[PDB]
Structures are given as C-alpha cells and as structure tokens.
Amino acid sequence: MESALTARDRVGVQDFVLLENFTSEAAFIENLRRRFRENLIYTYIGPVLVSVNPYRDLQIYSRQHMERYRGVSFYEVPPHLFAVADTVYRALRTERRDQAVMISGESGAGKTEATKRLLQFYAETCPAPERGGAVRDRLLQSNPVLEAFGNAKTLRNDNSSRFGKYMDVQFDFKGAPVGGHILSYLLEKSRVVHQNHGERNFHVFYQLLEGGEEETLRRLGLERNPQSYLYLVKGQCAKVSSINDKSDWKVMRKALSVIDFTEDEVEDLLSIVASVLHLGNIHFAADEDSNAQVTTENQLKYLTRLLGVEGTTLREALTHRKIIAKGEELLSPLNLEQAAYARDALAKAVYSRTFTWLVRKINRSLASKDAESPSWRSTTVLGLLDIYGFEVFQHNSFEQFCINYCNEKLQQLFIELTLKSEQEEYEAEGIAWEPVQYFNNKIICDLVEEKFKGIISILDEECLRPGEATDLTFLEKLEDTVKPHPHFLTHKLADQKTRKSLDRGEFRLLHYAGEVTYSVTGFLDKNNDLLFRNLKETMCSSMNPIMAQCFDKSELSDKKRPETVATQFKMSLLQLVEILRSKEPAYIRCIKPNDAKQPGRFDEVLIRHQVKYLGLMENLRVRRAGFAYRRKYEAFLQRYKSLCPETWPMWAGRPQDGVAVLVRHLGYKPEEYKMGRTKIFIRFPKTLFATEDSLEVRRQSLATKIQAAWRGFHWRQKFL
Amino acid sequence: MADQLTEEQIAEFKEAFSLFDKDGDGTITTKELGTVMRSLGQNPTEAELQDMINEVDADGNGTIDFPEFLTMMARKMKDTDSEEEIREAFRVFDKDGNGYISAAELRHVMTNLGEKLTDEEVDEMIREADIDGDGQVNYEEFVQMMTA
Amino acid sequence: ETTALVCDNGSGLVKAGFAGDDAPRAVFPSIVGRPRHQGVMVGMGQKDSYVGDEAQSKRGILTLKYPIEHGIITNWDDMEKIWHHTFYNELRVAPEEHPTLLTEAPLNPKANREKMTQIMFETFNVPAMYVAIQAVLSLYASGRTTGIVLDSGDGVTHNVPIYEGYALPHAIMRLDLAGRDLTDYLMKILTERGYSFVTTAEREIVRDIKEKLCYVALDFENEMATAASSSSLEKSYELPDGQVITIGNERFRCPETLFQPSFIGMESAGIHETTYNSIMKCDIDIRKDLYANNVMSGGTTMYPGIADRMQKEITALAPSTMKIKIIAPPERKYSVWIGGSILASLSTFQQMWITKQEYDEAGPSIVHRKC
Amino acid sequence: ETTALVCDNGSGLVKAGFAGDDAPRAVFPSIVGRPRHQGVMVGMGQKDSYVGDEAQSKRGILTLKYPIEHGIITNWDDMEKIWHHTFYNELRVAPEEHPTLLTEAPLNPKANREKMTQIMFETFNVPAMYVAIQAVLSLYASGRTTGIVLDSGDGVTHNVPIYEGYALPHAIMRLDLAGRDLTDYLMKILTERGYSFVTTAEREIVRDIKEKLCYVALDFENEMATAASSSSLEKSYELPDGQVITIGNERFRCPETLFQPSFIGMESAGIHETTYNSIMKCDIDIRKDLYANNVMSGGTTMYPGIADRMQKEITALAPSTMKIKIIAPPERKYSVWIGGSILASLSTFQQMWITKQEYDEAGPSIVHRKC
Amino acid sequence: ETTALVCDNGSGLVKAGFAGDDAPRAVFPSIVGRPRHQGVMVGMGQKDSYVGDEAQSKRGILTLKYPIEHGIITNWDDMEKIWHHTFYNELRVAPEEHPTLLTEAPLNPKANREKMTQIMFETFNVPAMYVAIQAVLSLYASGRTTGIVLDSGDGVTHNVPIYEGYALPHAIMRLDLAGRDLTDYLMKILTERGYSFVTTAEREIVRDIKEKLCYVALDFENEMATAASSSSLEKSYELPDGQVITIGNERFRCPETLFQPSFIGMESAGIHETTYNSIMKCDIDIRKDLYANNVMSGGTTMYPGIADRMQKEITALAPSTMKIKIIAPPERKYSVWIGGSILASLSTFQQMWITKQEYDEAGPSIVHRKC
Ligand SMILES: Nc1ncnc2c1ncn2[C@@H]1O[C@H](COP(=O)(O)OP(=O)(O)O)[C@@H](O)[C@H]1O
Ligand SMILES: Nc1ncnc2c1ncn2[C@@H]1O[C@H](COP(=O)(O)OP(=O)(O)O)[C@@H](O)[C@H]1O
Ligand SMILES: [Mg+2]
Ligand SMILES: [Mg+2]
Numbered sequence A: 001m002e003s004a005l006t007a008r009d010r011v012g013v014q015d016f017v018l019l020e021n022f023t024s025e026a027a028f029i030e031n032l033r034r035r036f037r038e039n040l041i042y043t044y045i046g047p048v049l050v051s052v053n054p055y056r057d058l059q060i061y062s063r064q065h066m067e068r069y070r071g072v073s074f075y076e077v078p079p080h081l082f083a084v085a086d087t088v089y090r091a092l093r094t095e096r097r098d099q100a101v102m103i104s105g106e107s108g109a110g111k112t113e114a115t116k117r118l119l120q121f122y123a124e125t126c127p128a129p130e131r132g133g134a135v136r137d138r139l140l141q142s143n144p145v146l147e148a149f150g151n152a153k154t155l156r157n158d159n160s161s162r163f164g165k166y167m168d169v170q171f172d173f174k175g176a177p178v179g180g181h182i183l184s185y186l187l188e189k190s191r192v193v194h195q196n197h198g199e200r201n202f203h204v205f206y207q208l209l210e211g212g213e214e215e216t217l218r219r220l221g222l223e224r225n226p227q228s229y230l231y232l233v234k235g236q237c238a239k240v241s242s243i244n245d246k247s248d249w250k251v252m253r254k255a256l257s258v259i260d261f262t263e264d265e266v267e268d269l270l271s272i273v274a275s276v277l278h279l280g281n282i283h284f285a286a287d288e289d290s291n292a293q294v295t296t297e298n299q300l301k302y303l304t305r306l307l308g309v310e311g312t313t314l315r316e317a318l319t320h321r322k323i324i325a326k327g328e329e330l331l332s333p334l335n336l337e338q339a340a341y342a343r344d345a346l347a348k349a350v351y352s353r354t355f356t357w358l359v360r361k362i363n364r365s366l367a368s369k370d371a372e373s374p375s376w377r378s379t380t381v382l383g384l385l386d387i388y389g390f391e392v393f394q395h396n397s398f399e400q401f402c403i404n405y406c407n408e409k410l411q412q413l414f415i416e417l418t419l420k421s422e423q424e425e426y427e428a429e430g431i432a433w434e435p436v437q438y439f440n441n442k443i444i445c446d447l448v449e450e451k452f453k454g455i456i457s458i459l460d461e462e463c464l465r466p467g468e469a470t471d472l473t474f475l476e477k478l479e480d481t482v483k484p485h486p487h488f489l490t491h492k493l494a495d496q497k498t499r500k501s502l503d504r505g506e507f508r509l510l511h512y513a514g515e516v517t518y519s520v521t522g523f524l525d526k527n528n529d530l531l532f533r534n535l536k537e538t539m540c541s542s543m544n545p546i547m548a549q550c551f552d553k554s555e556l557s558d559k560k561r562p563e564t565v566a567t568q569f570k571m572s573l574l575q576l577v578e579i580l581r582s583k584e585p586a587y588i589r590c591i592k593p594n595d596a597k598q599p600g601r602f603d604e605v606l607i608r609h610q611v612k613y614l615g616l617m618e619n620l621r622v623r624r625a626g627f628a629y630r631r632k633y634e635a636f637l638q639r640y641k642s643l644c645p646e647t648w649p650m651w652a653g654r655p656q657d658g659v660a661v662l663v664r665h666l667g668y669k670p671e672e673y674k675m676g677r678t679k680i681f682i683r684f685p686k687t688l689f690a691t692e693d694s695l696e697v698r699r700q701s702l703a704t705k706i707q708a709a710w711r712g713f714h715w716r717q718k719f720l
Numbered sequence B: 001m002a003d004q005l006t007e008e009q010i011a012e013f014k015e016a017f018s019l020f021d022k023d024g025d026g027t028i029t030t031k032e033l034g035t036v037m038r039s040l041g042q043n044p045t046e047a048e049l050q051d052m053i054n055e056v057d058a059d060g061n062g063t064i065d066f067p068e069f070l071t072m073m074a075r076k077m078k079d080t081d082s083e084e085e086i087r088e089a090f091r092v093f094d095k096d097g098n099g100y101i102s103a104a105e106l107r108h109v110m111t112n113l114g115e116k117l118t119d120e121e122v123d124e125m126i127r128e129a130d131i132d133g134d135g136q137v138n139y140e141e142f143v144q145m146m147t148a
Numbered sequence C, D, E: 001e002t003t004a005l006v007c008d009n010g011s012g013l014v015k016a017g018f019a020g021d022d023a024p025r026a027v028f029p030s031i032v033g034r035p036r037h038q039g040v041m042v043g044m045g046q047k048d049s050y051v052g053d054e055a056q057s058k059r060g061i062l063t064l065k066y067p068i069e070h071g072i073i074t075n076w077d078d079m080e081k082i083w084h085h086t087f088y089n090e091l092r093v094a095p096e097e098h099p100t101l102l103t104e105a106p107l108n109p110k111a112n113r114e115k116m117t118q119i120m121f122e123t124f125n126v127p128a129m130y131v132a133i134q135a136v137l138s139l140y141a142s143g144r145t146t147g148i149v150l151d152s153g154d155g156v157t158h159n160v161p162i163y164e165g166y167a168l169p170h171a172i173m174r175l176d177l178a179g180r181d182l183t184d185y186l187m188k189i190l191t192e193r194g195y196s197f198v199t200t201a202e203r204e205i206v207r208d209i210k211e212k213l214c215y216v217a218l219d220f221e222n223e224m225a226t227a228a229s230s231s232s233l234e235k236s237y238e239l240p241d242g243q244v245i246t247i248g249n250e251r252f253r254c255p256e257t258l259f260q261p262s263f264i265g266m267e268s269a270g271i272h273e274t275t276y277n278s279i280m281k282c283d284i285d286i287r288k289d290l291y292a293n294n295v296m297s298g299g300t301t302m303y304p305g306i307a308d309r310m311q312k313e314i315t316a317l318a319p320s321t322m323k324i325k326i327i328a329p330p331e332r333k334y335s336v337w338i339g340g341s342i343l344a345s346l347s348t349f350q351q352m353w354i355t356k357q358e359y360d361e362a363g364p365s366i367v368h369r370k371c
C-alpha cells in the first residue's frame, strides 16, 4: 500500500517492483539490508514473498499479528508471513479450489521454521483449533524421522534436506481443518550408495551406529565404529559432524513412538537400515567368463534375517539378471560391474522405498476420520511444498546437476505462471502488452530434457551403450552433439580466456542462477539404477513386513528395463510440476544473511549469491512489467482527489474521469501513465512517489481546516 | 466583501463582543479577534487572522475596536468549509473506510501539521471526539457534531 | 504411443516387442498354416489360414509353411499375414504410430530389404523404419564393441567380426546351415531306427525332439564308440499320439553336422573352422581380442556342450598362447532381439531411421543409402 | 606459466616438454590414423582421426599415415593435428604462454621452416619461437664445444662437424636413410623366410622386431658365414596374435644397410664413410679433435655393436696414429631433446628468439634471417 | 630328345611345353579334386584324386583344391601330382631327358625355391633346372630390354622395373591381389541379386562369369550412375543347368577392385598407384623410358577396357609432358610362357642352368646363388 512511501529514505520500499532503478541488484541488496537492520524483514515482489533469516525471537509471529492479518488483502497492509498465510486461506475459501504455498531457500534460511509458523497460524486462526492442532502436531512431530531418513551433511551444512518434502492440511467446504497429508518428491537416493569428500550418507546410519542399545544392535552384524561399512566411509566424514548423532537418535526413536510405530515396525525398520550397511559390505569376485560370485557368507548370515529372504535366493538375485521370454525364465549371470550396480541399486531401492513407506505410514495416519464422501459437499487442501534450493559448491557433481535442474524447472514454472498472470491482467484491463525481454528458461530446460538431445537423454545412453564407457567418454559425447547451444560450454569448446576457469573433465551450464560448472567424475557410476525383475521378485517374496509392503507382485508384469536415476528424477519432477500447475501457488523465498548464525550481520557476498540462487532479478523484471503500479480508480481517486480541486471533496463523473482530470492537474505526461478498463497504470514509480509527497504537503491544509473547525466549535461550547 | 454588514448581524457581534469587553475593557486583543469570531462560530485560521491583523496593527497597542473587528469579519464573511469537505479531510486518514480514527493518530495530525493544537486544546478535543470513550474518534459523527 | 517397434523376423520364430523391453512380447513360430482337408461341418468357424500358435495347435489338419527360406523372404503374400498377425494379434498396436526396426542376415539379396521397406511404408504406413544385421545386434545385447559373433538362426548361420565398433565386412562369413537344416537331417537319421517322419507337421515333432535331447560331443569319435558299445547315452521321448521314441547315437550325430556339414553333403567347413577363418581374415592386431571376445547367439547355438566343443576346436586352430574364450550366455536365443531393444532406444540412433518422407523422395531404393 | 616449450618434431616420434626438464614429457609416434572401414555401432564416440598413442592402440582399423617424409613435413593438416595433440592432450598447455623451440634436420626444403613458423604464429599464437638444427642440440646434450655429430632419426641421417662452437656449413653431410628406410627393408627381407607384412598397421610390428632383435655385425662377412652355417645367431619374436616368428641373418642384414646403402639401391656410401667425408672436408688443423669426439644421437644409432663397428670402420679409413673415440651415451635416443632443453634454458639465448612482434613486421621470411 | 622343358606354374593355371614352341602345349587348371561323396558303383573305378581337365569335367562330385596360394606352393603332395600330370599325362615325356625352366613371383619365400629344386632333382630326376622371376620372362615375349612389367596372375600381381636388362630389385612391388580375390569378391557381389555360390565347384562357375561378362569401367562413377539408371549395361549368362543369371553393375564392380583394393578391405594401393610408386623408386633419368613401356601380362590383365583405364590413371599421376604408353597385346595371358620359351632357347642361357652336379655339392641352397 501507498502508506509506506513517505519512508523511502528510512525503511526503503515495501515491494521491490516500485524501485525506480529496478535493474540494480546492488540497490535491491541495499533495500534488503535496510529492512534487515530495521527488523522489518519481509518484502514482496508483487504476489511473491521474500524473507531474510533474523536469527531472533521476533514478536511478528504472535497471536495479535495473526488476528491483525486475518481477513486483510495482501497489498492493502504491510508484508509479513501471515499476509500470504491469510491470502492463501481467503483464496481457498473464496475460489473453493485448493491452493499451495511453496517455500524455497539455501538450507539454514528458515524454510522449516517458516513452515512451522504457517501451520501455527492456521491452527490458531481456523474454525476448529483442536483438529487443526492435532494435524499441526503430527505434521511437525513427523520431522525428526523424515530428517534422519532424508537429510544429510554436505560440504555447506550439517543437516541439509536432500528431498522435496511436501504437505497438505485438508479443509472442508465449511473452512475448518479436516486432516492432512505428507508426500516426498525428489529424494537424492544416489547418496545412499556414494558420497563426495566431506559429505555423509543419510543420518539414520550414523544415528543407528552411535545410538547405543547394543543388545538391540546385537541381532545385526553391528559395529559401533561407522568406518567399518563401505557405504558410510567413501565421504571420509563419519565422525566430524558438529551435531551429536546419539542425542538425535533418541529424539527420532521417541518421535517414531509418538507417531504410532509399533515395536515390530521399529524393529523391522532398524533391520532394514542395518541391512543397507550389510548390502554395502558385499564383495564380489570373478570366475571363468568374468561372472561374479559373492565371496563370503558373513554379510548374508545377517541379510537373510534382516531382509527376510532365503540366502540361496539372495546370492542368486545379486549375481543373476532374470529374463522371462515365451514363458521360460532365463538366469543370465552378472560381471563384477553389474554385480556392484545390482547391490548398490538394491540399496537405493530398499532405502528409498522404506522412506516412501515412512511417508505413506504417516500419510494414512493424517487422513480424514469422517467418510469424506457424499453428502460431504466438497474436499479442499492447503499445500506447503518445502523443496531444496539451487545448489553450488567447489565441485558440483551428478547430485547437484539434478538438484539444479529441478530448480531450473521450478523457475521455468514460476516465471511462466507469473508472466501469464501479468499478461492476462493487462488484457483484462484492455492494455496493449508491453514487449519485454527476460531469460526464458524454456531455452535451457530443453538442454536437460529434450527427448533425444538433452543431457539426461545422453547420460541415459552412456549407461546403456555397449562396451567401454567412461565419465570422460560421456563428456566427449556432449561436446559432439549439444555443441552450438549458447547455454552449454566445456574446456574444449571454451575460448583461450574462459578456458582458464573450466577444466578437462568438466562442462558448464548457464542456469537462471548464473553459470555452474559440473565435474563428470561419477556420472556413469551414479546414474545407473539396474534393479532387474529378479531382485524385486526376490524382495517381494520376503518374510519382512516392510519389504512385503514396499515391493509387490504387480511390478513383475512390467517388461521394461530398469530406468536410470536421471530418468527416475525427471519423471518424479514432471509429476511435481504438473501437480503445482494444477494450482495458483504462492511463493516464499528465504535468504540466509550469514554463516555465523549471527543477528544483524548482513554478509553481502553470501546474499549476492542467494539473490541469484533465488532468481529475484528475473522475477523483479517480470512482475515490474511495463507498468510498475496499478490501482482501482475508486481507491486511487479517494486517496488523492484532494490534489485536484475539480474532484474535491467528491467527484460526479466516472471515477475514471475524476482520475483523468486529477492526472492532468498533477501534470502526468502521456508516457508516464495509462488508463485501463477500471484501473490506473503508472510507468515510472517516481510519479507515485511525487503523488504521495504531494498528498503529504496537502495534509498540512487538511489539518489546518480541522484545527480551525475545532476552535470555531470550542468557542461556541465554552461560551455564547 | 460579500455583504455590507448591518444591524441584524451586528447585534449578534456586539452581544458576543460584550463577553470580551466583560467588566469594561472596551477593546479586544489582536489574536482575540479570532476568539470573538470563533465564539460567533466562524472558522478563521491563524494565518487568516494574521493577514487581516497586518492591515489594522499599524501603530501597536495590541488591541482592536468594534468597527475594525466588524471590518475584518466583513473579510471572513464570504464562504466556509462544508461538512463533506471537513469529513473528507478526516477520511484521508481512515484505515479502511471504516468511519474511525485513533485518538493518538488525531493527536499526531493535530500536532505534527501546521496551525498545531496546544496539548490543552488536543485534550479538550479528545474529551468529546472520543465519542465511544475507548480511544477511537468516529470522525463522520464528530464532523457532523463539529460543523453544526 | 511413440515407442520404436522392434521386430526380429526369425526364419524359425518371429520375435517382436518395443525398444525398452527386455524380452520380446510376441514370440511365435514363423509359420502360416493352411487347411489340408474338406470342411465337413458347417458353422464350425474354419479360417482359410492360421498363424503362429493358432497354426501349431492345428498341426494335423494344416499344411505348414514358413515364408522364409535361409533368412530370405520367399513368399510375400504369407509374409504380410505374419506382420499383420505380429502387430494386430500378438502386440495389439497400430503400426501407423511406431517407427519399426527390422532385422536380416548379412549377404542377403537386395530385393529382400527393398520389399520389406516397401511393405512397411505402403501396407502398414509406419512413420519410419530401419533394417539391422542380426549378428551386429548380438554385440549390443552382449554389452561389447570388440568381438566376433557367430549367430545360428534356423535357416542360416553367420559370423561377423567387429573391433572398436567397426565391422570388417570382407571378414563376414555366411553359412546356410542351422536348426532347420539339422532338423531335416534328424528326420533322415531317425529312419535308421525305423521311426518315420515325412509330413510338414512331423518336422515340428522332430524339431521338438532336437530342442530337448540332442547335444554336441566334446570328441565325436569317442562318443560314437561309447554309444556303439553301451546303452547309457540313450534317452526316450513320447510322441503326440502316445508312442514312445528311444534314441542314442542319434542325439549327437545330429548337432555334429555343424562341425561336419558333409553329413548334409555340403562342402563348406564347420562352424569352428568358419569362425577361425573369419578371425584369420582380420588384420593381425585385432585377432588377440577376437579370441577373448568370441560371441554365440541364436537358438541353434543352444545344444549342451556346444561352447565347450567350440573352445576345444578353436584352441586347436589358434596359436597356443591365445586365451580363447567363447561367450555363450543363458539367454543367447533372444540376444539378437535384445540388441534391437538397446539400439532402437539409443538417442543418437533417432537420426538413423528412414522416415516415410525419405521413402517418398527415393522409393524402396533408399535403404541401401542408410543400412 | 613462462617456461619455454621445446618440441623435437621427430620424423617418427614426436618428443616434447619444457626447458629445464631432464627428458621429454611427451613421446609418441608421429602418426595420424583415420578409420579404414564402416563404423557399424551407433553413438560409439568414434573419431574422423586419431593421433599418436591413440592411433598406435587402434592399429588394426586405422590407415596409419606419417606427416613427415625424411624430416620434411609433407602433409600440413595432419601436422597441425600432431601439434594440437602435443599441446592440448599430452603437454596440456596453451602455447600463448610458452615460447616454443622447434627443430629440423639441415639442408631441408626452404619452406619447411617458413610454414612451421606461420603455423606457430597464425594458428597456435605462440609468443615467440626458434628452429634449431637437430645435430647442434646433440652437442649441447654431450656438454662439448667440439665434435662431429652423427644423428640418425626415423627419416634422415645427418652429420654436422662443429669446432669450438663454429658449425662448418660446407662440411655437413646429409643422407636420406634412417630407421623407416630400414623398417621398409626389413619388411622386404622378412619375406625370404615366408612372413609377409604390408599394411601400415603391420609396418609397426616390423619396426617392433627391428627395435628388439636387430644388431650391427662387427664384421658382416664373418657373421653372414656364421648364420648361413649355424642356428647360434637366431632369435624368436611373438606376433600380436601369438604366431612365433624366428629370424637369423635378418637380424644384422637390416642394420647393415647403414654401412652398405646399396641394399636399398642407393648411390651414397654408408654412415662410416659419411662421417669420414665430413671429418675430411674440415681443414687439416681440427681433424684430430673431431676423431676424438664422434657424438652419436637419434634412435637409429641404438643397435648393439654399432659403436664398436663404427670405431672399427673409421680406424681403417683414418691414419693409424689417430686416437679415435665414439661418444655413444646410453640415452642417445633423446640427446636432441636434452640439447633443446639446455639451449632454451640459457640466459644468453633469451634475446635470440623470434617474437610475434618481429613476425608481424617481417612475416614468415624471418626464420631464414634469425636461424 | 634334348629340348628344354619350360613350366610356368600359374597360381591358378599350369602352362607348360618345350622351348621353341609358339605357345604352351599343356594349359590346364592347377587343381587337384578329391571325391566328396561315398563310392558310386562297384566296378566303376573312381580314382582317389583327379587333376586339371579331369577335375574340371568331374566338378560336381569333387572338392577342388588349388595347391598354390598367391604364387606360394601351400600343399606339396598335391603339387607333385600336378607336375607328374604335366610331364607324364599332358606332355608325355620323361623328365630325365629335359633341363627344366621353372618360374615364380618376386619377393617369394626361399623355402619355395629350395623345395621346387629338391623335387625336380630328388623326384623327377631332371638333368638341370632354373627358377626365373615371372615378370622378367614377360619382357622377352614383349621384345624389350627396358620396361616396367605389371603382371597379374590368378593369385598375385607384381610390378618389376627393368632398364637395359638391369632389374631394379629395390623398386619391385608385390601385391597379393589377383583373379582369385576378384572371383571371391564377384561371388559375394552376386548374392546382392540373390544368386548364391559357395562350393569350390561353384567358384569355377563364377570364374566363367568373371571371364565372360566383367569389364573395367573407363570412369567408375559415370558407369555406376549409368547402370543405376539404365538397362543397356545388364547382361544375361546361363548357368550349367539352365537357370539364367542377369547382372548389371556387378560387371564392373568386380574389376574395379584392382583400382580400389579397399573393396576387399585391403589397405594397400591400387594397381595404377603401384605401377606409379615403382616408377617413382626408379632413378630419375629412366622414368621417361618406363612410362613409354608399361607392359601388361597374366590373365587378370585381359578385361575389356583395362588398358584405356590404366593409361588414363597413370596420366593423372605422372608429369603431363610424359608420353604414357601401355603394352597389352592379344596374347598377354601367355607372355610369361612365350618369355620362358625365348629365354630357354637362348644360346647365352645354356651355361645358366643349375645342373644335378651343383645340387649334389650344395643341396637345395644352390638357388639362393644361381637365380
Ligand atoms: N633399440 C633400438 N634399436 C634400433 N632402433 C631403435 C631402437 N629404439 C628405437 N629405435 C628406432 O629409433 C627411431 C626413432 O628415433 P628418433 O630420433 O626418435 O627418430 P625421430 O626423431 O626422427 O622421430 C625409430 O626408427 C625406432 O624404430
Ligand atoms: N578374358 C579374361 N577376362 C578376365 N579374366 C580372365 C580372362 N582370361 C583369364 N582370366 C583370369 O585370369 C586368371 C588366370 O591368369 P593366368 O596368368 O592365365 O593364370 P596364372 O596366373 O595362374 O598363371 C584367372 O583368374 C582367370 O579367370
Ligand atoms: Mg534360430
Ligand atoms: Mg630423432
């Protein structure tokens, strides 16, 4: 709203589209710094919200703020998290369509904390606080489990979220909370097998082996030292966490109990986690035609109990690729590569399916106790997607290649919905569309997707092509086929200046968040998810209740080859995109102002990175449109008519006519404004600044009129 | 200006002037011109009073006679601000168009803006502008009270 | 749908599916049967021709014919019924959606490729098509790009040597001897015991003996002397009418024909000497790697002991320091098709298809410019 | 970086590195190979050409061309690929950082330096370059200001007398016979026993015999009568495919062509008489110091017995009073490298480069004036 | 009798007679046929082996074996039967009367000359013998002391430059490509129309197609595009049972292999390049006299259009001022015979023969010295 515009010196703007020099990344960062040190931290970009982590117990999330924001449109009142929370609830009630918030940020920017504040706002504001409270309680109490199974230590943070967590609160036709949901998209399951230097595998393994209860570990092939297991050691990082695994394991065990896991499900679950260690410790040796054999029973004597499958079957499943053709089955033996991939693919599949079951067990628990069926009038949901940010380190690899493509696609949605929302408002107000240039991400989502030329469709060929194939041969095929595309570059294709910054065995992409260089070592290792029907047939024959729910006989009918992790990721993502395209989502973007976890330290180097990682300059350009500001003629005329005597104190024509003579009186030039079907439009916000400045000097006369009227009344009350 | 002011109006003016003559002072102070005009229900501004006083304060003595008070009243008597104009001068500050402003926001506009109320005049204003006795002025009803 | 059809026109079994499958979806014998007798009963629902397992179930009452002679399509009017049955009955897809990868043996006639292409575009309206040499596809299924493939189909056997993904086309050897030639020989051999087989349906009885009981002698003269002096090598099989067959030296005197084609009266040397002669026609440096990457595929390579025989024979023909290994995996019957599963899935293969636009520009002559 | 590149473009091995290195960082054959056959497997990462060790690996499918004829660059587009592989793949440097010292044999065609120069400025963009005479570098490697250098490479033999740093330009001898002309002779002489080698891929196998079995006779008619009458001189070599070759008098009839060029039909007398004539074309005052300092270098001087034969031969041509010596060090294959490394390391050399500033003024004509 | 025998053992045709004959008396194919089938009738009397015209009549029942591989005698026991048939059955003379002039290709194995010598003395008991290089003999039939002889036999092609009777043995070229590899390639090419040939008895059919129909294209792409678009180049040939072949561009794709050995996957240069590359190894003054006297001999030089093609090909390679001529007379199949007839008739040759006395002193090693 206009009420802030006198404070353009002290606070800075409320919504960055009103910035005059809107192409200045420096001025945008400076306005963020000003609001941050003033503690007025939330700011819009049109309907979008931007935030910065204050590291402090700011009273802005208090109940009096909830009841201030409840029922108030986002643009008439100042930015806070609850303004989007209320706006999504009003949209959910008014349109009757379901709606979703999307949270995004670098980890430590407050994504989880903001999600918790959104849920507390709904639980305290909405009509049934007991049922909303039970859904909030279970949604947030689920978190230690979904962290232990789904977070990991990277190069940059000790407890990063490696998966696109998602939630719903379920809402009825009346507007009360009914129940909820959890879904997890985009789990980084490559990490379950392989880690880069300084990174851990998923936290549950280190929490398990540190956690104690050694008699409970005694059923397993236990080792209290995590260096003992081939899937935990590759990152060289097991002990060097700043956060205490033993203490967190006890929190997660307590949470499983509060979540209504039975002691049998917990014992099965701990057996699966322990089995994933014993899957890792399998060593293969060759025979006559280089066919693989499991060398030792020392793993299998645990795996057979833990995964509930016969050892004579599992030995065969790990070392043979079954075909069924013309109704005869054909066991074909695996070489040492394919046996390693079959084991590691089994570990990825066992784990990610167990995690999907830890979600599904909660998703069936949060659901409606009422029948949710006619004469139940309508079902609705309020979504809270909690996806990982765009991600850059010293050595970006396959994991960050997929995460950054996911974020490129989430940007390619977010820009599309915002651009179309501006165009459709322009055409609704009868405004001719102002032609605008912006980084259309559809140019470069094609470089990663496109059916028989994108990087995924080539990385899936180098997993499949016969003979010798290597991470460098993959790179040499990119350089032979994507070659002219202006967003792709390599040390071969680079000029003699840029080739100093980009090595042999690397390629480079111009993502929305700027240019990122990928190191190909471990691309063909990580993309393979060879899980032949023999291993699924074996595992769905298991005695173990988890394995029996997680693999089933229906998949065994599918004649397709195993799909590679890049394709499994591409498909999982394209479902998340079409799930979000079904809605009109509200976006929350969060900035971590320093690594020190320190109040008031605005580290501009770290923020200039994040202002690029969160795409704020493209969004600012798109939502700034041709016109920086627009308003209903009635609301604009009511505020500013005092500047034009012909409209003062009230106007008798169309509100459009009153605004038209007001902009002639204010002397706006034909290029500085436009007249829409029911709204004013403004091309340069200096015009609106001068108009509130004009109203601020006009208020002097308004007060003088009131003071004179009061004194002319007062002297008739006390005398005559 | 708009009328040759006459016995019918002068009778009310002289009745009002008698409250400021009081015991026998015979003449009214230069700023107290505004006091007698405001007791007669005019809304003169302090700047308007000063601009009229600049053309009678030719030799000092701090005070003015009834004929020159009548002459300066004959300047102010042309027009006065309407109920709708004064209502709209409050309406610009309304939080929604809800009809209410806080007594603290009224105290702000009355003391941060030119021709300021004294703290005594604000407390006396709020004494009946706080119509519901809760700290909110209903400015539409308070303007219909004040512009009567 | 948009997936590539893949369709290995076996001379004995049709094998078809989509690129992305492991196994074929359609497998059926490459036969069109036609009724041999008067139709006695009205309203019984007799067809004028049957295909695949619809024909093989009606053996007694049909003249069985295969539309392929030695990997060459020899009757086109029946071959349109095979492909129609493949797409419409066995796969249940419309070919107008699917680009189609077909196969053939090397050194075949050019009339064969042209007329396969003309039929795919003009009778089935495919969007695009391609034809691949069968032994080349067998390397993709093997996971290898250096090696020599011996592929023994049903009407033909062929040897292709490939190094670093280059075929040596002068070192290709084609031998017109495989499982149907061995079957007609086993029909002759069994008359020595008194078991007589002569009808087109009885060839399928003797083929079913061969797929179960026949095996390759590690040393032929020694097995033959063992069978001539003991009963321990004899086995029995029950004919479709319940009569009991019993056979002995006839179990290995049948497959031995591959190593000794003079049992048919052919002149050209055995599949060991024919695999050696192609290695020994390659440029000397590659031969060390061809011996470490010999590959076998197609169902006529399935006999018990054939790879152990083959290793023993090439260990005699090759120099004594060469570490000869003969890859012959448990699925090897379907490997030519599994190569087509992979190839039609490759992204850099999607420029390689003949499109129907390139057919309209150049007619069926286009294939030789692409394949 | 700022270190000088040094780059002995050998007529058969490229030898490259930086000044101050003891030995070349890259040594690879001076070959560009292009594929001879139909590339059958799709998306294979197959290349239009392979360079050096890549082409030495894939021999059996590549036509192995050499861009250098007798030390003369005879194909420039392949030679640009050889320098590109040298800089970009083997050494892994940008030539714009590195002043580059090239070499050539003396008496070379006049344009070989000019076109080597133009390619270093107008294609690799070097900051500066120079073109040394190869045999002069071999004296820098020997640590001597006086000597006569016998250099025999793969393509050329040349013979430079130097006295106290004065190279005598009239007395230099050049002979267009070295290790390739011997390989193509051994390729012919081995047909006497039966072994036939004729492809460019097989030439590298006959070179690999030549490097491993051959030696120089101390007296040829004595060894020739010994080999014709006893098996005592024979040795055996195993081909890539495990065939065994055995050879006898062919072990020294190959190196003997250096001392008797008439086996190739050549006019000019051998490497002993060529060393004598270049000593003897120096005026009489210095010859005693040349006889005391016969420097050998380059890989054709590597045979067993050759320094003893050379000392025996030259003693029979010289006066009986002379204290003859031959400086054949163990490392003599790389002396042209070690000399290029020494030369480019000197303080007094750093003004004598040809800079791109001088090339931009004088054009490619500059190397005839600076070198 | 006292006349010398002359005996040009072809790699494919034996051509034999006496010195002073105009022509060979015996011309017959160099084949030993052994019966493939079980014995026909008691009292018929099949022989254990048949030679020459007997095997060429009895083809259907025989495994035809040629004992000569590219001019090298690869089976000796078969070769003794072929010489015995030549002397006793065809010429009808006792070899113990006749000094015997044998021939072989250049760059041949030394074991070949030794074993031919041993067999002529220790089995045929001839009084004396000599072992001439084939292309040299071709100059006597040509009536020239100077020329470069392109000889193409059945099994080998070779180039020998000779100047004023001096042979130039550094400039000889031997190519293991001739009428047999052209017949195996024509066997492959004919499969493209669908005709299959695989027995050695059927290679003798395809040899008659090569002799009757094939011709050298004067310009390959122009003939190729003409055959690819018009019917006038296609000819019909009737097989020995009445089946009719018709062939088009197969008529010149077979002969084009001589100019493009890469069709066999063979790397070595064409016969036009190989006739130039030997002239280019001759000393400069004589190249002018070789271009005036390129001599063609041996049956594989008979094709219609090969002289016109060859003169066009060297004209593109040679300096444009040179007068390239080619000598290709009607009799050029027999010029090595008419050569041996003249050489053995020379009075100045009668001291040249290796007598049995010299063999009794030196053993078979004598032909390393005398020839
Ligand atoms: N032990 C050896 N005996 C004889 N020749 C050798 C030996 N080692 C290498 N060679 C020969 O050395 C030659 C390479 O010498 P080099 O000086 O590097 O040649 P260039 O500089 O011309 O490339 C080749 O002909 C090679 O076969
Ligand atoms: N008219 C011809 N046209 C083409 N090829 C011919 C012709 N006459 C003979 N030949 C071929 O010439 C070869 C025989 O060459 P010839 O010199 O007579 O035999 P050899 O080399 O064994 O001495 C055979 O391959 C034969 O088919
Ligand atoms: Mg088969
Ligand atoms: Mg050298």
Ligand SMILES: [Mg+2]
Pocket: E010, E011, E152, E153, E154, E298, E299
């Ligand atoms: Mg001949």
